[PDB]
């Protein structure tokens with residue numbers, strides 16, 4: 174179990190003004206630290222956020238959070254469940270800012286809600302330095318869905334934070350799972366909601382990406398294929414080629430028109446990963462990977478994800494028999510026999 178700690182700086186808050194926080198399980202024999210960002214969509218105006226507050230309150234408030242959480246997948250401490258990093262220090266950061274981890278806006282007389290995702294990450298890092306993170310050799314910032322997009326938006330800011338605080342020796346890296354989306358045409362008749370959200374949240378994007386796209390166009394930096402080339406920290410990208418959240422936004426729920434649409438989506442996703450040297454992209458219809466207990470089940474070209482992540486570690490010290498770039502070439506969901514079939 175990982176144990177809850179509410180932030181000591183109570184001005185860094187969830188949407189409703191309650192304190193944000195993190196769940197922690199220490200491993201004092203390890204110098205590796207894994208900080209995982211939860212996902213769960215977002216909200217972009219008063220009415221949309223009020224609806225989320227009625228029926229998704231744990232994503233907007235800490236008042237009902239439990240005292241502990243079980244670590245699963247890459248957060249598991251058992252070697253059999255987590256061949257990659259079972260002995261690491263484990264941190265789960267709940268998503269309670271509804272801003273894709275981009276916000277830097279406090280509640281006030283002018284704002285019903287606070288959007289502080291980017292500041293929550295910075296404050297978690299600061300408070301962990303007193304609990305052992307100061308001794309780290311590697312800090313892996315990971316996340317799934319909106320948390321995967323949050324990794325891309327925040328990894329370089331964490332690296333800058335630690336440098337300026339006097340810890341230049343800690344190697345900061347990112348792992349973005351199910352957060353690599355395409356701004357494509359829908360199958361039947363989303364970027365406007367991101368544009369509106371950024372203004373509502375006072376959202377921030379990485380500086381090099383901001384300077385490319387310039388004023389009013391920061392929404393571009395929420396799309397992995399546009400923000401990734403601008404990043405300096407090493408980032409490993411995990412992405413199902415036929416992600417269910419991508420298909421949902423595209424209004425896909427099979428005749429020739431839809432067959433061509435699905436094949437084209439897979440082709441375009443594969444193309445965007447061609448110049449991403451650390452990546453794992455199986456040809457499956459699914460959503461999320463890294464905190465599912467059965468994440469060891471899938472393989473690409475005969476290599477599992479925990480193996481690919483281990484090979485990435487080695488590469489950051491091509492390797493014979495230890496690949497890091499693994500993208501399926503077959504063009505239809507479940508053409509890879511290791512794809513999930515139902516759920517547990």
Ligand SMILES: NC(=S)NNc1ccc(F)cc1
Nearest residue numbers: 355356357358359363364365
């Ligand atoms: N929701 C958004 S901005 N889709 N992008 C897009 C819209 C039309 C098109 F022909 C190609 C791409």
Ligand SMILES: NC(=S)NNc1ccc(F)cc1
Nearest residue numbers: 363420421422423424425426
């Ligand atoms: N209602 C269903 S299942 N898909 N449509 C859709 C859902 C969410 C969204 F942000 C855009 C479109």
Ligand SMILES: NC(=S)NNc1ccc(F)cc1
Nearest residue numbers: 467468470471513514515516
């Ligand atoms: N649903 C079945 S058969 N396995 N579960 C699972 C398979 C692959 C993965 F990346 C995560 C979970």
